Scaffold this motif. Structure first.
Motif, short mmCIF file in Angstrom:
data_model
loop_
_atom_site.label_atom_id
_atom_site.label_comp_id
_atom_site.label_asym_id
_atom_site.label_seq_id
_atom_site.Cartn_x
_atom_site.Cartn_y
_atom_site.Cartn_z
N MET A 1 -2.86 7.41 5.11
CA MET A 1 -1.88 7.28 4.04
C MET A 1 -0.67 8.19 4.26
O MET A 1 0.45 7.80 3.94
CB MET A 1 -2.51 7.57 2.68
N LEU A 2 -0.88 9.39 4.79
CA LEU A 2 0.25 10.28 5.04
C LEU A 2 1.23 9.64 6.02
O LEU A 2 2.45 9.71 5.83
CB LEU A 2 -0.24 11.62 5.56
N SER B 1 -0.38 4.39 -1.22
CA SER B 1 -0.46 5.51 -0.31
C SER B 1 -0.42 6.84 -1.05
O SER B 1 -1.21 7.74 -0.78
CB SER B 1 0.66 5.45 0.72
N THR B 2 0.50 6.97 -2.01
CA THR B 2 0.59 8.21 -2.77
C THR B 2 -0.66 8.42 -3.62
O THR B 2 -1.18 9.54 -3.70
CB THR B 2 1.84 8.21 -3.65
N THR C 1 1.60 6.41 6.56
CA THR C 1 2.18 5.19 6.02
C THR C 1 3.41 5.46 5.16
O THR C 1 4.16 4.52 4.88
CB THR C 1 1.14 4.42 5.20
N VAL C 2 3.63 6.70 4.75
CA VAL C 2 4.82 7.04 3.99
C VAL C 2 5.85 7.79 4.83
O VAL C 2 7.06 7.64 4.58
CB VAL C 2 4.46 7.85 2.73
N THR D 1 0.79 -1.22 0.00
CA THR D 1 0.00 0.00 0.00
C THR D 1 0.83 1.27 0.00
O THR D 1 0.25 2.36 -0.14
CB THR D 1 -0.94 0.04 1.21
N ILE E 1 -12.52 12.23 6.15
CA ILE E 1 -11.54 12.72 5.19
C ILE E 1 -10.22 13.02 5.89
O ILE E 1 -9.15 12.63 5.41
CB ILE E 1 -12.08 13.96 4.45
N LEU F 1 -14.86 19.76 -2.12
CA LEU F 1 -15.86 19.88 -1.07
C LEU F 1 -15.85 21.23 -0.37
O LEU F 1 -16.84 21.58 0.26
CB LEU F 1 -15.65 18.78 -0.01
N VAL G 1 -8.05 11.46 -1.85
CA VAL G 1 -8.82 12.05 -0.76
C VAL G 1 -8.72 13.57 -0.80
O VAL G 1 -9.70 14.28 -0.54
CB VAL G 1 -8.37 11.49 0.60
N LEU H 1 -3.68 7.14 -3.04
CA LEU H 1 -4.81 7.41 -2.16
C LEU H 1 -4.77 8.83 -1.62
O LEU H 1 -5.81 9.49 -1.53
CB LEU H 1 -4.83 6.40 -1.01
N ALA H 2 -3.59 9.32 -1.26
CA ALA H 2 -3.49 10.66 -0.71
C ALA H 2 -3.99 11.70 -1.69
O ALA H 2 -4.72 12.63 -1.32
CB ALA H 2 -2.04 10.96 -0.30
N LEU I 1 -7.13 10.50 5.55
CA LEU I 1 -5.95 11.07 4.92
C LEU I 1 -4.71 10.86 5.77
O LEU I 1 -3.64 10.52 5.26
CB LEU I 1 -6.16 12.56 4.65
N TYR J 1 -11.30 14.97 -2.94
CA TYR J 1 -12.57 15.06 -2.23
C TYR J 1 -12.60 16.31 -1.36
O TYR J 1 -13.59 17.05 -1.35
CB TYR J 1 -12.79 13.83 -1.36
N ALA J 2 -11.51 16.57 -0.63
CA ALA J 2 -11.43 17.80 0.14
C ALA J 2 -11.42 19.02 -0.77
O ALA J 2 -12.06 20.03 -0.48
CB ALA J 2 -10.19 17.78 1.03
#
Lengths: 116, 155
Positions: free
Chosen positions: B148-149, A98-99, B151-152, A94, B141, A112, A105, A101-102, B145, A108-109
């Motif tokens: 993932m932040l 991770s990159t 996890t790196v 992941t 959110i 929004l 999201v 997914l970041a 968020l 979305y922010a």
């Protein structure tokens, strides 16, 4: 027939042509068939002796497979051919997700709060 | 609310000559408060305009200091309790949503002002449902968020 895996019919039709010998094209199909058949068999199957693959398509006991095996894999052993496929070390991670997914999201922010 | 003041001489009023000899449209910018006017405003004392001096060293050392945190950004807020909060909030939308249906049919009737006053004693799902949705989206959110932040940043 080519769209599906039905190929025994293709050689059956290879001997039945409406116009003429048409061999100027059947030779082209040979490149598009053998390469595909080998690719399919490349999966994580077990040993296959040099008796099915030899007398399957049209030939009895040629040397083509020997060349065929040489340019493909199929390590030579005690009449033992292997086709190993793991595709397991690469999955189950992941950090690279991770990159991705970041970024997801945050969008979305992004969409929004700020006015479009 | 300060409104610094100063006294006016009783001789002037006895003389009747207005004081402060206005020579600029600067002091007549703030309307005197009626409460202050009742007392000796412009009768026994006159107000003086009050302003403030601000500099970046003062501001940056106050504005960028009051509400700040050091490391709370990368904290996952009791992951076990987070989903429990979601369940309670979402479960409230199950009943809240149902009342929304009953709050749409009876609406769009005559005298909307009558309808407007009719929402002064009972919860309105139109606003209540939105309030819960707002908190739900931001909490996840942010909470997601940070997952993932982190996890790196750490290995």
């Amino acid at each position: 027939y080519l769209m599906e895996g039905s190929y025994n019919k293709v050689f059956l039709a290879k001997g039945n042509i409406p116009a003429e010998s048409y061999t100027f094209f059947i030779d082209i199909l040979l490149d598009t068939i053998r390469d595909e058949i080998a690719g399919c068999i490349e999966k994580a199957y077990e040993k296959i002796l040099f008796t099915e693959a030899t007398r399957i398509l049209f030939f009895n006991t040629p040397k083509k497979m020997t060349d065929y095996a040489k340019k493909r894999g199929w390590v030579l052993g005690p009449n033992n051919y292997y086709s190993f496929a793991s595709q397991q070390q690469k999955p189950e991670d992941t950090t690279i997700p991770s990159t991705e997914l970041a970024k997801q999201v945050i969008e979305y922010a992004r969409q929004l709060e700020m006015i479009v | 609310v300060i409104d610094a003041f100063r006294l006016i001489n009783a001789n002037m009023m006895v003389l009747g000559h207005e004081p402060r000899q206005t020579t600029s449209n600067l002091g007549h910018l703030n309307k005197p408060s009626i409460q202050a006017l009742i007392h000796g405003l412009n009768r026994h004392y006159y107000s003086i305009t009050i302003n403030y001096r601000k500099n970046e060293l003062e501001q940056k050392m106050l504005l960028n200091l009051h509400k700040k945190s050091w490391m709370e950004g990368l904290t996952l807020q009791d992951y076990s309790e987070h989903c429990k909060h979601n369940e309670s909030v979402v479960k409230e939308m199950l009943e809240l949503a149902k009342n929304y249906n009953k709050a749409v049919e009876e609406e769009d009737k005559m005298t909307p002002e009558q309808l407007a006053i009719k929402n002064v004693g009972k919860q309105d799902p139109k606003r209540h449902l939105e309030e819960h949705v707002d908190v739900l989206m931001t909490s996840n959110i942010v909470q997601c968020l940070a997952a993932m932040l982190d996890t790196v940043v750490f290995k």
